[PDB]
Design a protein around this ligand. Structure first.
Ligand SMILES: [Hg+2]
Ligand SMILES: [Hg+2]
Ligand SMILES: [Hg+2]
Ligand SMILES: [Hg+2]
Ligand SMILES: [Hg+2]
Ligand SMILES: [Hg+2]
Lengths: 140, 140
């Protein structure tokens, strides 16, 4: 997983070019003015902007970007025990499970971003605006 | 920041080679078996294996691994404000401060690895056997 800030001079270090090309372009947008909903980007990457169990993916990574508020995401980094997982919904790429093993809590502040690769589980629940960029693993 | 698990089949996906080269080298060893102390890996890269204020670095990234026990590391993904930091030590690449802004706590269990690039404040608070690999950012 990767957790950094759009605001930090060097956030680009170590990133996969594609997630990098895109944090460049978010830095272009007036993130605050973005309309909640799904915004397309290229032909493969889209965006969902949102304003108010754990989840994981097979096909896409998430780049999460808090834009306003403060948010605690639950996150695991050990590969999940799949056998305990609800099943996969081939339509929205996901499986759910009540729990995360080896769990820790990342608190996001405006600027923070978080990339969870497929199977890295997470759980935006709690304690706002943000967006979540869908990037197909293949592109990395 | 990178948080990930030297233990899930997709770990290398997204990892800078240099760092992959190292997870390799590591995954090819007896880490319980490791002599505490500085082990040199090549001419540029060296590791500290260890059996136990915030630190930041300019020149070298930490690959940290927990080999056993459980370890809690407070961690900053936003740019430190460097006026508070204490004062660079060039010989051991570090600057301290008692605090971290926008702190979070990552919990290390064995098989788990955190890459911290320069200016990422970190505090192995530890609520144990570990290693920290030093790798020069020139190389990512
Ligand atoms: Hg991005
Ligand atoms: Hg997700
Ligand atoms: Hg669960
Ligand atoms: Hg590793
Ligand atoms: Hg360090
Ligand atoms: Hg400080």
């Amino acid at each position: 997983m990767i957790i950094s800030s759009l605001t930090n001079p060097n956030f680009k270090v170590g990133l996969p070019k594609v997630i990098a090309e895109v944090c460049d372009y978010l830095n272009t947008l007036d993130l605050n003015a973005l309309e909640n909903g799904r915004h397309d980007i290229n032909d493969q990457i889209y965006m969902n902007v949102m304003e108010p169990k754990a989840e994981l993916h097979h096909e896409y990574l998430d780049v999460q970007v808090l834009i306003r508020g403060t948010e605690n995401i639950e996150v695991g980094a050990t590969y999940p025990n799949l056998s305990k997982y609800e099943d996969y919904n081939e339509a929205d790429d996901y499986q759910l499970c009540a729990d995360i093993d080896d769990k820790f809590t990342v608190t996001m502040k405006p600027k923070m971003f978080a990339v969870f690769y497929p199977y890295e589980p997470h759980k935006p629940c709690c304690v706002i605006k943000k967006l979540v960029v869908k990037v197909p693993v293949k592109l990395i």
